[PDB]
Amino acid sequence: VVIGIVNNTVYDPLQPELDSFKEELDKYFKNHTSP
């Protein structure tokens, strides 16, 4: 609806504290599957 809008990406600020947790939450899922 607005005239002059432009395309870009808005950075989620929960991800930086969760993307590192993706190497924690998801890895903890994989932490006990193999053993």
Partner 1 sequence: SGWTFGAGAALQIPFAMQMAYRFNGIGVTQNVLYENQKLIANQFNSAIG
Map residues 1-35 to x or -, x wherever contact with ligand NAG holds by CB under 6 A: --------------------------x---x-x--
Q: DSSP for the chain, please give it.
A: --TT-----PPPSHHHHHHHHHHHHHHHHHHHH--
16 binds, among partner 1, ligand NAG, a copy of itself, none (CB under 5 to 8 A by kind): none
Report how far residue 17's alpha carbon sits from residue 23's, in angstroms, rounded to the nearest whole number.
11
The footprint of a copy of itself (CB under 8 A) covers: 14, 17, 21-22, 25-26, 28-29, 31-33
